[PDB]
């Protein structure tokens, strides 16, 4: 049987972080031919059994909509770190978005605002529980930040489509972030 969770982590690395290591090139919106991905995964002993059907199943069973398959191509919807900016659709955000973080980063976010750091975009959540889960990746007592996203947008900060639970933004100045 396939560990679809571990397969999902491998696909994340290929489609967000190091496509070159797989001999892949992503298009401007992040897509690659799914047969080229499968061929690359089959260089790895653990993934030689993985079929195109398995990639659909991995997506269906996942707790998050990380990837999409369309007309024989696959992309990650968010998370990228590669030098070439992934073109995402600009969108007007809801009034409020959230961002869960680690206690150890709060001072720096107060001073500088939210920054993309190792990714191309700041990632934000649509609801509190989702944001706390983001923060739990780094801190058992994560900090919830509340972003006045529509105010930021009206003052020129760009936001972009990730998926229904993950919104993307350029750097967000501190004045739009509530820490309490
Ligand atoms: S046999 C040859 C295998 N391939 C290679 O050797 C090439 C380089 N391999 C690697 O770098 C690692 O083996 C990878 C593929 C990254 C897997 O290592 P980890 O077990 O440590 O994975 P992480 O926990 O660090 O997470 C990796 C990214 O995957 C996201 N993710 C996708 N799907 C899930 C699921 N179901 N559950 C948890 N996390 C998942 C992770 O959030 C993470 O995302 P980042 O963008 O890296 O933050
Ligand atoms: N000025 C500043 N100074 C200091 N620290 C600052 C800072 N600005 C921001 N930070 C913090 O710098 C960390 C960046 O960390 P990340 O790149 O991993 O971003 P993120 O945590 O949002 O996570 C992305 C997605 O990854 C996962 O998705 P998957 O499961 O992989 O699909 C999640 O669920 C997400 O959707 C975060 O703590 C920021 O708060």
Author numbering: 3 to 182
From the article:
Tpt1 is a fascinating enzyme that transfers an internal RNA 2′-monophosphate (2′-PO4) to NAD+ to form a 2′-OH RNA and ADP-ribose-1″,2″-cyclic phosphate. The Tpt1 mechanism comprises two chemical steps in which: (i) the RNA 2′-PO4 reacts with NAD+ to expel nicotinamide and form a 2′-phospho-ADP-ribosylated RNA intermediate; and (ii) transesterification of the ADP-ribose 2′′-OH to the RNA 2′-PO4 displaces the RNA 2′-OH and generates ADP-ribose-1″,2″-cyclic phosphate. We succeeded in growing crystals of Tpt1 from the mesothermophilic bacterium Clostridium thermocellum (Cth) using recombinant CthTpt1 produced in E. coli. Hexagonal CthTpt1 crystals were in space group P6122 and diffracted X-rays to 1.4 Å resolution. The refined Tpt1 structure (Rwork/Rfree 16.16/18.57) comprised a continuous polypeptide from Leu3 to Glu182, consisting of nine β strands, six α helices, and four 310 helices, organized into two distinct lobes spanning amino acids 1–85 and 86–182, respectively.
Here we close this gap by attaining a 1.4 Å crystal structure of Tpt1, providentially captured in a complex with ADP-ribose-1″-phosphate in the NAD+ site (generated during protein production in E. coli) and the pAp moiety of coenzyme A in the RNA site. This structure, which mimics the step 2 product complex of the Tpt1 reaction, yields keen insights into how Tpt1 recognizes a 2′-PO4 RNA splice junction. The 1.4 Å electron density map revealed two non-protein ligands bound to Tpt1 that were acquired during production of the recombinant protein in E. coli. The molecule associated with the C-terminal lobe was unambiguously modeled as ADP-ribose-1″-phosphate based on the electron density and the anomalous difference peaks overlying the three phosphorus atoms. The molecule associated with the N-terminal lobe was convincingly modeled as coenzyme A (CoA) based on: (i) the density of the terminal ppAp moiety in the Tpt1 active site and the anomalous difference peaks overlying the phosphorus atoms of the terminal pAp moiety, (ii) the electron density flanking ppAp corresponding to the pantetheine moiety of CoA, and (iii) covalent attachment of the terminal CoA sulfur to Tpt1 via a disulfide bond to Cys46. The pAp terminus of CoA is a mimetic of the dephosphorylated RNA product of the canonical Tpt1 reaction pathway. We envision that: (i) an endogenous substrate dissociated from Tpt1 after transfer of its phosphate to NAD+ to form ADP-ribose-1″,2″-cyclic phosphate; (ii) the RNA product site was then fortuitously occupied by the pAp moiety of CoA, present in the E. coli cytosol at 1.3 mM concentration; and (iii) CoA remained bound to Tpt1 during purification because it was covalently tethered to Cys46.
